[model samples]
Every structure is written in structure tokens, then in C-alpha cells.
Target chain A: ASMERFLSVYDEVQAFLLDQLQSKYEIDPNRARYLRIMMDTTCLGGKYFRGMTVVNVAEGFLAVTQHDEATKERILHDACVGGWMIEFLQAHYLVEDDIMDGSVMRRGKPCWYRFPGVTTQCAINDGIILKSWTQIMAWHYFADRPFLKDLLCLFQKVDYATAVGQMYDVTSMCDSNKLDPEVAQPMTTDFAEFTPAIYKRIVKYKTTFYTYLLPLVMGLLVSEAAASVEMNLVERVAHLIGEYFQVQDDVMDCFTPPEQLGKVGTDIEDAKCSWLAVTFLGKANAAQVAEFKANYGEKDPAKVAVVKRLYSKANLQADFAAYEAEVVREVESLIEQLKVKSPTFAESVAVVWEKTH
Target chain B: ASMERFLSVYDEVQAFLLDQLQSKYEIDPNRARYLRIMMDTTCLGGKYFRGMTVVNVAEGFLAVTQHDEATKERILHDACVGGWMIEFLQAHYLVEDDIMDGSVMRRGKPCWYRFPGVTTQCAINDGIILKSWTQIMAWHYFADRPFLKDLLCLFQKVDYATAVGQMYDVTSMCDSNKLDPEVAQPMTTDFAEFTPAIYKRIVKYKTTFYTYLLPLVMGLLVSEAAASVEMNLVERVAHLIGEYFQVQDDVMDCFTPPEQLGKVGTDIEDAKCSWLAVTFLGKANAAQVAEFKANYGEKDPAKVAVVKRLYSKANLQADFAAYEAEVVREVESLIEQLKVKSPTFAESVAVVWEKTH
Candidate 1:
């Protein structure tokens, strides 16, 4: 049933962006039109992984309850709004990240700043507005809830944590030149010199915190989990899964064709610091490194093909596969540590796994 | 008076950019060092227009009540935090704007993105975290105040409004290529091409809303004027004062000497759509328009100097002076409308004129 109701939620989440545009900006039709366009480009398209994750968590609660009319409506409503929460999180990063990467396209559409009339400067602010909406929306929706403050704080902490992780990612990729000798340094002045270990750590803190652990942590708060339910096990499992999930995305950026991934060699050209690039940088022989340096980000198809060949020659795909398996094993092991005094732990584990292949 | 008890508070506001680095990234000591370098350049060095605005408002309140201890403390506190709120707003825009503009330097230091190891992406996210703190700090400091929600809502509304205004500014600038034949465009877009006009509106929506109107409004709320104070009067006066404050900034940007303004030709290259620019664009002759297009954004000192000459020749300076007189007249009219029965109105208006100017 992976029909992706998450996409619909993405639209609703975007509606919130427009709503803010109305409330915040004075009535300038052109301004309103432009912001809507930028926000639309940034938000209307995403993998919706976070939204689905929230849905799966809600489904955990649904599994035990007899599907009476009231119970079914409760699950549906909770899951729907929960999906909005995830999309909102995605909007937070996408709005800003697009500006930094100078990315022109996303989800088969123009990037927000690249939208015909948006200055990249404004697009970046739009991103902030998107992130701010998380708290704003949370307060509005959760005001009557008994756990309103707790739920809002939970979102705030996770968002701030993810924001910090994003900062590290930018700092690492932009100015690796300042790295000390003892610290893990890139092999060259180019951003392409990062290793798989560094890339994994970046993903762990940056993407995983928001996309993986935070969603469930917020959901748990929303569900009003019992005091006896220790969150450590749940958090541990989520981090492991998140690392692997983002790695798979990184792999898709490399191994998957444009048709499958829905874009072509974006990670390389954009200097994405992907798992594959890091693995190749870490593992490639001198000849392979030379080949990559020649074609890694060049626009020529043959050049990109050469870089792909070097990646293959270095067995980067197998290396990523092995890393993926190790992560899955770790996640499974962590899941085993869950306290299932209630069925919530097992149910959450199942929801988390659905993100990966 | 200038002893700097607020130095630590200043540091805290600036330190937020660095602390955000910890939350967003891997917290590499090297990265933090470079980030600190960038922070020292921008946030630490400002005209303190927003802060000074707060100080002025507080001083005005003191003028009205020589002995109201409780009211004085509340106004002083509001004024200081109002200034802090400006720095927070700076953080919100700086990180994202740097990434958008591909700016390599600001205030003579590396732009946050150009930090040797930090990815520009992280800086953008870090900026978002900085903004969230403004609201969080407001809650932390003022949640106990009786009019907390009113003050908070004002902050929320102003922030929302500023984001909207920024959105318009970005969009309009991006659409500079469009030739609108409709001569009857609203005052908003009609002024979009002028740097001075744009500067005025931005200062109003972005600066005055929070720094001037907000602190005074917060005072009115704190003083329990909720029922007695007319909201519409507050809005009208805030608009008038905010307009004058930004016009003064424009005057400083152009007519003021480099030493006096602390920089030369602030509006021409700012992509700012300032009031002077808008007014000139509205009134320029064929020859003047040609000169503007030629030398408007050039980096050469001589070319910039030439544009300044044309600004004077085109009477943009005189036009601005006239506009300033009009705004002052309006503020005076609004003040005359205030009566003793409307003490809140009188006090708030007095604060705006004395402090915001």
C-alpha cells in the first residue's frame, strides 16, 4: 500500500506556505505570486520519506485497535497531519539547501531561487520562513492538546539539532582547506576529496537526525508514550536506520540511472559529498583518481561515464552495499533491544524499516 | 550611559551564529574557528540602527513618566530586547543571503559560506536557527509578563510580515527584466526600482515593525492599555514613523559622506530598490536613465562617483528631501490627533518620533 498519500500532504503543507505569504506579506499581488512560485518549486516535490515515516508510526497505533468508526477516523486524521509535519521538515532544508548548491532543478521542476523571478537571496529567506512555520503550525494545531508545549518543544529541539548538523555539512564541504594534519583531511583542495567515514558522520548528524529520529521522537510525544517506555532504544534504532536510508539515497545518486533516480549525475555536479563519491575518494587507486578528477563534474556524458567507470573499477558499489548491510544489521540488533511492554516498539521498528529497500 | 552592560548580551546574540554551528554540523573545532571569524565581521559590526532605535524608544517612555518605576523598567527591558531582536533578524537573513548571493565577503571578512571548511549550505541553515532563537529568547525573557501573548503575537506578526516583504523585494528585483506597461501599479511595485524607496519600505516592514513599533506596542500592552488603546492609531503612527526612519537611512546612504555614513553609495549596488532610486526611476529623463543603466552597479570608484553626480543632477536628492518633509508632516498630523484621554497613543507616538528618528 505504498500509494504515497504523502504527496497529497505535500500539497497541503505548501498551502500553509501560501497562507503565511498572505498573513505576513502586505498585499502585493506580485510578491504574493512570486513567493508562492518559489515555495511551490521547493516544496511541491520531494521523496516524502519523512511523511511516510510518520504515517507508519501512526499505523503502529492503528494495528492494535479494532477499526471502529471513531478509532479509524482518529488514525486517519493523526496520520494525515503527521504527514504534514514531515513535509514541513523537508521544506525547512530544501528551501535553504537549494540556494547553497546553486541547484537549478528539483523533482523535475526549477529550484525555488531558480524559479524565473526569485533572487537566490530571497529564496534563502523563504527557507527560514518555511522552517519557522514548523513551530508556528505546531503551536496552532497543538494548542489544545495536553502535550502542546512538550510536542512543540520536541519539534524545536529536533529542528535545531538538524539545523546544527546542516551547518557542519556546509562548513565541511566548503572549506576543507582549513583541515589540520591530524584531523581527517581531504586529499586535495577540491571538495571531492572527502572520505566515506566523514560523509557517513555528516549524514548521521545532518539528515538522519531530522529525517529519521526526530519524526518518531515527535510522534512519540504526540502519542503521549508511557513514562516506562525508554526512548533510548527507539532513538538508537532510528539513527541506524536513518544513516542507512540516506546512504541508499546517496547510492541512488551514483548507481541508479537518471530514469530511476529522476535526475542525472546531480550529486557529482553539485558536489553533494555523497557516500559513493566519498567511498571512491577513500578507495580509488591513483589511475582511478586521475580518471575521476578528469570527468567527475564535467558536463560531457562521456566524461561522466568515465567517472562512473572509475567508481566501478574501485568497487565503490560493493563497498556501499557492504556498508548498507552492516547498518541494517546494526539497526536490527538495536531493534531487538526495544522494550515491547507495549507493542509500540515492534510497530515503530517495522515503520522505520519500510524506508529502506 | 555607554558603559556596555549589554556587551554580553551583544555577544550572546552574535554567539548564537556559532552555537548554531554546533547544532547543525559535526562541530569540527577548525570549522567553528572559521565561523567565529565570519561572525566577528558581520554581526559584531553594524551601525546598530535597530538597537539605537530601541534605546530611543525607551528614552521617550522615560520622558513621559519621570517616576513610574514599573513602567520604566518594562520599557527599558523591551527596548533592549527589541534591539537584540534586530541582531537575531540579521542572523536570519545573513546565512541564507550569503549562500544565495555567492558572496565571498561581508564587512571585510569571509562570508559565512566562504569559511574555509564549512559548506555554504550549513550557513544558510545556521541562519534559520538564529531566527528561531529570537522567538525562543522572547519566550524565555517575557513569557512571565502579563501581556506575554500580545507581545509574542506582535513579534510573530511582525516577523511574518517582514518575511513577506522580503519575499516581495526578492521577487520584484528578480523581475527587473519585465517591462510592465501598466503605469498605475500600486505604490509598492512602483517604488521597487528605486533604492531609497525600497530601503524605506524594507526598514518599515523589516526594521521598524520589530525595533520601533513593536517595543512601543509591547509597552502599551505591558502597561495594560489593551482595552483603552486604539489599535488603529497604533498602526497608523507606526507606519508614519517607520516611513520616516527608513527615509532618513536613505538620506544617509546617499547624501551623507563616506565617513559620516560609514560607507559610500550604499543603495546603488545594494539591489535594494531604495526610495531615491524608485523616485528617480519614476522621474528620470532619457539621458539620466541611460547613465543610470551604465554606471548603476559598477564596482569602479569613478563609475560609482559618476552615478552619484547624476542622482543629484536628476534631483533625486531634492525629491527625497521633499518626501521626508511630507512624512514629517504626516507624523505631526497623527500626533495632533492624540489627546490626553489617549495616553497610550500619545506615549507610543512620542516614543516613535524621539527614538525611531
Candidate 2:
């Protein structure tokens, strides 16, 4: 896959962020060093999946691999730097999010806020600092580009939507906590309200748009093919695949092994409104509902086991397998529809589908 | 003191904020209602001193009163909305500041985050949403204006500086808490490090630039005088006045009645690095320093009283009064210098000085 190029993008982005902090802002060297390490720990630690996806889409469109070495090198270089912008945005969100979620670990290490000598107050500014640097980099590199305003507006809209989605997630969690103070979790007992429709809303707002749609749309935006591409059409397709990706994540949280995932599952512990919980709510009998309630958000081993027992009783694994198959069929059909009009768009969708599934 | 026109600007800016949230964003009506209330309660509740300074400066330059009613109304309308943008920036800072400070009351009512059903998470988004709206309003109204980009960039710079100042304020406070865990308050024992120079850095970063300089610069940018005005001069004057304003605020915290101030002062209790504390730190003897430490940052009446007694022993109030008189004279001389160059700039300075002092 020629993945070595993406690693360099990570290094360059860190350097660019640090350079701005030092040269333009004249931040204290000791303080800048702390921030530099913080950025690397939070941003570079990620798999670069989102960033690579951006470069992948750009490469697929520009056909860099088909060109000469010089042409390929320039295009890939810019694309890779451009791609790190997405990762930068994600890292900003994650740092604040860990604080909001009371997350202890991120990527198998202590969360940035939990680091010694770092208070919640410092973490708040850290998030904003990342965002400011992201803006600086975008303006520095892409300001002269034809799609500069479009790119800026694209980032703004995605940022707003993600913030709104976060609002919904936390507001709901806070509401749930108020209802049952003892549980103090995000898990909802109201099956009628927390329907699949609501589940889809959270998924679309929180995950689908930023994770899938943003990378692909940004690729189209920065390319010469921008004017010809139907952004609305691409958005719809990306979101369809995005929802499927989230549903898979939900399934994996329930079934994936701790060693394979590299972190213990926390969805249930955090009382997340996962697909499994929402689905089980519909299928569980009154007695089963009691069992689910007792064990749903508990972290104890026995409590988690009882919740798993209920999921087995409802055959959730089989249900998820059927759901995944259905999603793949729908995605394939959507790509087929897209391929007729734009092969590049279909290929973009196909690239995402293959990477995730 | 015909401040009637500035009042209209306040009403119009609030309308502009509410209109965008309702029409353009299509935010959930229930949520929009909450936000509208939040904006009003936070942004509009302040004295409108900053907002009116913007308009007052603009009106002075435009000479709207010398013209006919129709001409006067048109210029004032735009200037007022433009001026309110400064207040909008302040409101954004305050909402987050209150949460960070654990502030109890603001403008004679409960803090925005203290309202029922609003958690710290929701408050975080509220601050960002205000910022997003500020940008939207600026772009929507001034996009066609020649100075539009200048205005946008100006706001961004000020915002960044304020955040940096906030970073300094909290980081120092956190460091102090770490030094003396028993007190575990924001108070400092390291008189060697917490010098007046560091105090000035905090004040300049956090308060002076944004509160005073931004409003004045923004008014110039959006007015005919923008080209003729030397921005650096006004900024220097504004910083001079801003430092005095903060010192007065610190003085009021200890000496002024709570009823007169409209909110209970927490500076001493919160272990704030106030001007009074820093000044007393310099003047106190070894025995006096022991008494100051024992009482500083403690909420107990006996402890706070002991700190107050130390301030009396050092004649802090007499020191502050003399300091205030010195600042007013310097400010008057500076404004006199500005008046010869540009009366509108002089009027702007005079307007802010009157409102705060």
C-alpha cells in the first residue's frame, strides 16, 4: 500500500505545529516542549487511518502512481500534509473528549489530562491550542489554493456539526444520570425513546459525517475535478458507509477480544447508547430487562457477564452478522449506482468500505 | 453622557445573534431557546461598556449627529452592531472563564452553567457556539466591506492572545496549588517568582488586549477613520487603561461592599493573584507575611479577616487610591495627546475610562 509516506506526513505536521508555536507565538521553550510532546502523544499515536484515507482518496483521483517519480512525489507530499489536517482536527476533539468522558487511557497510555502536573484547566487550553495551530497550518499552506474558502468552510461546518453531536451525546447522558443518580451512566432505560432512529441520529451526527464524509469531500475539494463532482451525492454515499462503520464498531466492542482491541471494552461500562443495548432493549422480556438494567453499565466482572448472557439469549451476534451482510449489499448497490456516473467516486467509496470491513 | 444610542446597538446585536440561530442554523427550537437565553443572560447583561465604546468611537468619527436624522440612524445602526461584536467576544470569554473559575453568580444572577440541566459539557459547547456565531455575523454583515478580512483576522488574534493569557493565569494558579497542597488553593507562597512582572504579563495577556484594544481597533477598522488612525497608538493607550481597570477590580474585591459590586468577591478566597495581594507581598515584613499566608485564599471568615488586617497594616487601600490617581492622570495626558491627533480616538478612551472608573 506504500504506507511509509504517511509516517513522514505525521513528522512534518508535528514540526510545522512546533515551528509556529516557537517562531510566530514565541512560546516559552520549556512550555513549547511540553506542548510538542503532548501533540505527538495524542496525534501521532493514532493509526493515521483517517489521514491515510484522505491521501488514498487524493491519490486515487490524481493518479499519482501512474505518473513519473517527480510528479508523484510533489502530489503525494502536498496530499499527505493536507491529510494531517484531518488528524489534527480529530486529535483536538479527542483530548477534550477524554476529559468529558472521564477516560483514563488513550491508545494504551494515560490520557493527556491524566499526565502528572497537567490539570483539567491545562487540558482545556490544549484542545484550543491544537485548533489554533490547525487553522494556522491550513491558512499557511492552502490559503493560495483555489478551493481555500471552500476548504475553510468545509472544516467549519464539520466542526459545528460534531460539536452539536457531542452536545446531544452529553446532554442525553447527563439527563440519564439525573434520572438514576446511582447508575450515573449514559445507558438509557427508555426503549421507546432510544430507538434505532435515535441511534442512527447519534451515529450520523457523531461519526458518519466527520469520519467518512469529511476525508472524501476534502479530497474532491482540493482536486481539479472539484467543479465536476457532485458534492451532495458524495456526501450521501459517504454517510451511508459511515453508519455501517459505526455499527461494526458497536459489534466489535461486544465481541472483540481485549488483546486484539488493545484496550478493554468501555462502551458498556460508560453506558454508551450502543447498537447492542438499543437492540437488546427491543428484544428483552420484562424479566430480561431487569437483568439488563442490573448489569448494563456495571464494571464488575459478574455484572458484565450477566449482560453478555442476555445478549446471547437474544442472539445478538447472529443479528449483527445479518446486519453487516445487509449493509455490505446496500453499500455495493450504492457504489454500483455511483460507478455509472463517476468511477472515481465509486472507487472512493470502495476504498473506504474495503479498509473498514 | 447621552448614551441612548449605544443602548440601541445592544438591542440590535442581540437581535442579530438570535436571528442567525433561528433562521440560518435551524437549531432545534428548544435548544435555540436555551442558547438565546444564555446569550442574553451573559452577553447582554454586562454594562455594554465595551460594545458602546466601539459605537461611541465610530459615531465620533462619522459625526452622525451633525447630519440629518436619516443619515444619523443609518450609520449608528451599523456601528452599533459592529461594536457589539466586541461584547460578543467578551461574553464568549466570560462563559468559559466562569466555568474555569467555578464562579457562582454573574450580573446578579446565577452563572449560565449553574442553571438547571446545564452541565459543564454543555457550557463548553456554549462558548464555542458563541464564537462560531460571532464569525458568522461578522462574515454575513461585513463580507463585502474592504476591511472584512481585517476584522476577521483581528478577532482571531485577540481571541488567541486572550486564550494564551488565560493559559498563563490558570497554569500559574495550578502551579501554586501544587506548591502548597494543604491550602490547595490558587494562592502562591513563592513571592520570588510571582513578581509584579509576572502579574503584568497575566493582566496584559488576559484582560488588557482584548477588553480595551480589540473594541477600539475594531471600531477603527469598520469606520472611515480606519486608514488615518495609527492602530498602535490606540492599542498602547488602551493597554495602559486596561491595566488600571484590572487593578481597580482587584481593589474593589477587598474594600467594596458586595451589594455595591452586585456580586460577592472571590479573589481572596479563590487564591487569585490580585494586585492587592502582589503589592502587599512586597510591603509585608516576615511576621506580616506569615499572617498573610495563614489568611490568604481561605474562605473562613477569621482567615479572610486576618488577610484584610494585613492589607490595612500595609496601608494597601491608601496605596491603591494613590495608584488610581496616578493612572487617571497618565490616561488623561495620553488622551490629551490623542485628542490633538484624532478627537474620535480621544473620545473612545474617555468613554471607556468614565464607564469603568
Best by lDDT: 2
Model 1 per-residue lDDT at A148: 58
Single out the weakest 10-residue window by summed lDDT for candidate 2 chain A.
A176-185
lDDT of 1 by residue, B1-357 (tens): 521634556666556556655664446666666546544544566656555555554464466556567766665665566567666676566666556656655554556656544455445665676666666566556656776655655666676667655655554444443512222221232333456544555666665676556655655554455465666766787877877776677666778766665434445655456666667677888777777767765467787778778778886657766876887787877776765456545755665586655
For all the models shown, what interface RMSD does each have? 6.7, 6.8
Model 2 lDDT per residue over A2-105, tens place? 36887876677678767765675545555566667767776876667777777777777776226677756655665666677788778878887887777777
Compose the digit string of candidate 2's lDDT tens values, residues B176-272: 3243212233435654545677688788878987889888887777665666666667877887888888998888888889888777998877777
DockQ of 2: 0.25
Docking class of 2: acceptable
Per-residue lDDT of model 1, residues A251-280, tens digit only:
777787776666554666655577777777
C-alpha RMSD (angstroms) for model 1: 6.0
Residue B247 alpha-carbon offset, candidate 1, angstroms: 1.8
